Structures are given as C-alpha cells and as structure tokens.
Amino acid sequence: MSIEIDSEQGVCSVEIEGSRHRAPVDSLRIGTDAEARLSVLYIDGKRLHISEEDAQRLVVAGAEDQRRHLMADD
C-alpha cells in the first residue's frame, strides 16, 4: 500500500489493493505503530501501515508530522 498525493487538486489518496480514499492533504496525520515499530498514516482517522519514504513524502505534501521533526536532508 503506497500513499499517493495530488498536488494538482491538493487532495490526498492512499492505495490499498483498491484505492478508494479522498481527502485534503491538510487533513493528513502521521503516527507510529509500536506493533512493528514503524510509522503509520492517518486518512479520515484510519490507521494503516505505509512506507517509510511514503510517510516522509506525506508530510512534505503538507501532511501533519507527529512521528518526528519535519526533516529534509541529513
């Protein structure tokens, strides 16, 4: 499940064996899953497992960053 972004319209949509989401990028949120010690994504208030890099782009897109401090380079 790779997270998607729509800068054209400014909407965000995640893919999950049948992409069926839709919401504003300003309505995104990053979380952490102690279950596997990985970062998760919140869309509409749901909890799923997204890719690390995809989790980074989510914030870059304008999504909320609660996992770590909005970074860029190291």
Backbone as numpy.savetxt, mean C-alpha at the origin, in Angstrom:
# Nx Ny Nz CAx CAy CAz Cx Cy Cz
0.10 -10.83 -4.94 -0.72 -9.63 -4.94 0.15 -8.37 -4.94
0.22 -7.75 -6.11 1.01 -6.53 -6.26 0.10 -5.31 -6.19
0.52 -4.35 -5.37 -0.25 -3.12 -5.20 -0.08 -2.25 -6.45
-1.17 -1.59 -6.81 -1.16 -0.72 -7.98 -1.49 0.72 -7.58
-1.16 1.64 -8.47 -1.42 3.05 -8.21 -1.86 3.72 -9.51
-2.70 4.74 -9.36 -3.20 5.47 -10.51 -3.01 6.97 -10.28
-1.85 7.46 -10.70 -1.53 8.87 -10.55 -2.35 9.70 -11.54
-2.73 9.06 -12.63 -3.51 9.73 -13.66 -4.80 10.28 -13.06
-5.51 9.41 -12.35 -6.76 9.80 -11.73 -6.54 10.11 -10.25
-5.44 9.59 -9.72 -5.10 9.81 -8.33 -5.76 8.75 -7.44
-6.15 7.65 -8.07 -6.79 6.56 -7.35 -5.78 5.43 -7.14
-6.12 4.55 -6.21 -5.25 3.42 -5.91 -6.08 2.14 -6.00
-5.44 1.09 -6.51 -6.11 -0.19 -6.66 -5.09 -1.32 -6.51
-5.42 -2.26 -5.63 -4.55 -3.40 -5.39 -5.06 -4.60 -6.18
-4.13 -5.47 -6.54 -4.47 -6.67 -7.29 -4.37 -7.91 -6.40
-5.41 -8.72 -6.46 -5.46 -9.94 -5.66 -6.24 -11.01 -6.42
-5.53 -11.74 -7.27 -6.14 -12.79 -8.05 -7.54 -12.37 -8.50
-7.67 -11.09 -8.83 -8.94 -10.56 -9.27 -9.14 -9.13 -8.77
-8.24 -8.25 -9.19 -8.30 -6.86 -8.78 -9.75 -6.38 -8.77
-10.17 -5.88 -7.62 -11.53 -5.38 -7.46 -11.59 -4.35 -6.34
-10.66 -3.40 -6.39 -10.60 -2.36 -5.39 -10.69 -0.99 -6.07
-10.74 0.05 -5.25 -10.83 1.41 -5.76 -10.98 2.40 -4.60
-10.06 3.35 -4.56 -10.08 4.36 -3.51 -8.98 5.39 -3.79
-9.07 6.53 -3.05 -8.09 7.60 -3.21 -6.77 7.23 -2.54
-5.68 7.63 -3.19 -4.35 7.35 -2.67 -4.20 8.02 -1.30
-5.00 9.05 -1.08 -4.96 9.77 0.18 -5.71 8.97 1.25
-6.22 7.82 0.83 -6.96 6.96 1.74 -6.22 5.63 1.91
-4.90 5.72 1.88 -4.07 4.53 2.03 -3.41 4.55 3.41
-2.91 3.39 3.81 -2.25 3.26 5.10 -1.38 2.01 5.13
-0.19 2.16 5.68 0.75 1.05 5.78 0.74 0.51 7.21
0.82 -0.81 7.30 0.82 -1.47 8.60 1.89 -2.56 8.66
1.98 -3.20 9.81 2.95 -4.26 10.01 2.25 -5.54 10.47
2.76 -6.66 9.98 2.20 -7.96 10.33 3.24 -8.77 11.11
3.04 -8.82 12.42 3.95 -9.55 13.29 3.82 -11.05 13.00
2.80 -11.38 12.23 2.56 -12.77 11.88 3.74 -13.34 11.09
4.27 -12.50 10.21 5.41 -12.90 9.39 6.46 -11.80 9.41
6.29 -10.87 10.34 7.21 -9.76 10.48 7.40 -9.06 9.13
6.28 -8.75 8.51 6.30 -8.07 7.22 5.31 -6.91 7.24
5.47 -6.02 6.27 4.61 -4.86 6.16 3.34 -5.22 5.39
2.24 -4.61 5.80 0.96 -4.86 5.16 0.40 -3.54 4.61
-0.67 -3.66 3.85 -1.31 -2.50 3.25 -2.78 -2.46 3.66
-3.29 -1.25 3.85 -4.67 -1.07 4.24 -5.45 -0.31 3.16
-6.43 -0.99 2.59 -7.25 -0.40 1.55 -8.73 -0.55 1.92
-9.34 0.57 2.28 -10.74 0.57 2.66 -10.87 0.12 4.12
-9.74 -0.25 4.69 -9.71 -0.70 6.08 -9.45 -2.20 6.16
-8.98 -2.76 5.05 -8.69 -4.18 4.99 -7.21 -4.40 5.33
-6.87 -5.67 5.51 -5.50 -6.03 5.84 -5.03 -7.19 4.95
-4.03 -6.89 4.13 -3.48 -7.89 3.23 -1.95 -7.81 3.26
-1.33 -8.79 2.62 0.12 -8.84 2.56 0.60 -8.38 1.18
1.31 -7.26 1.18 1.83 -6.71 -0.06 3.35 -6.85 -0.08
3.92 -6.54 -1.24 5.37 -6.63 -1.40 6.05 -5.47 -0.67
7.29 -5.72 -0.27 8.06 -4.71 0.44 8.20 -3.45 -0.43
8.75 -3.64 -1.61 8.95 -2.54 -2.54 7.61 -1.88 -2.87
6.59 -2.73 -3.02 5.26 -2.24 -3.34 4.72 -1.43 -2.16
5.20 -1.77 -0.97 4.77 -1.08 0.23 5.45 0.29 0.29
6.62 0.37 -0.32 7.37 1.61 -0.34 6.76 2.58 -1.35
6.41 2.04 -2.51 5.81 2.85 -3.56 4.44 3.36 -3.13
3.78 2.56 -2.29 2.46 2.92 -1.80 2.54 4.28 -1.10
3.56 4.43 -0.27 3.75 5.67 0.46 4.16 6.77 -0.52
5.12 6.45 -1.36 5.61 7.40 -2.35 4.42 7.95 -3.14
3.46 7.08 -3.40 2.28 7.46 -4.14 1.51 8.53 -3.35
1.74 8.53 -2.05 1.08 9.49 -1.18 0.35 8.78 -0.04
0.49 7.46 -0.02 -0.15 6.65 1.01 0.49 6.96 2.36
-0.28 6.71 3.41 0.19 6.95 4.76 1.33 5.99 5.11
2.28 6.50 5.88 3.42 5.69 6.29 3.41 5.53 7.81
3.13 4.31 8.24 3.08 4.02 9.67 4.07 2.90 10.01
4.59 2.28 8.96 5.55 1.19 9.14 6.92 1.75 9.54
7.33 2.78 8.82 8.61 3.41 9.08 8.59 4.88 8.64
9.72 5.54 8.81 9.84 6.93 8.44 9.98 7.05 6.92
9.08 7.81 6.33 9.09 8.01 4.89 10.53 8.19 4.41
11.05 7.15 3.78 12.41 7.19 3.28 12.43 7.37 1.76
13.63 7.46 1.22 13.80 7.63 -0.21 15.01 6.82 -0.68
16.17 7.19 -0.15 17.40 6.51 -0.51 18.19 6.20 0.76
19.20 5.35 0.61 20.03 4.96 1.73 21.50 5.24 1.39
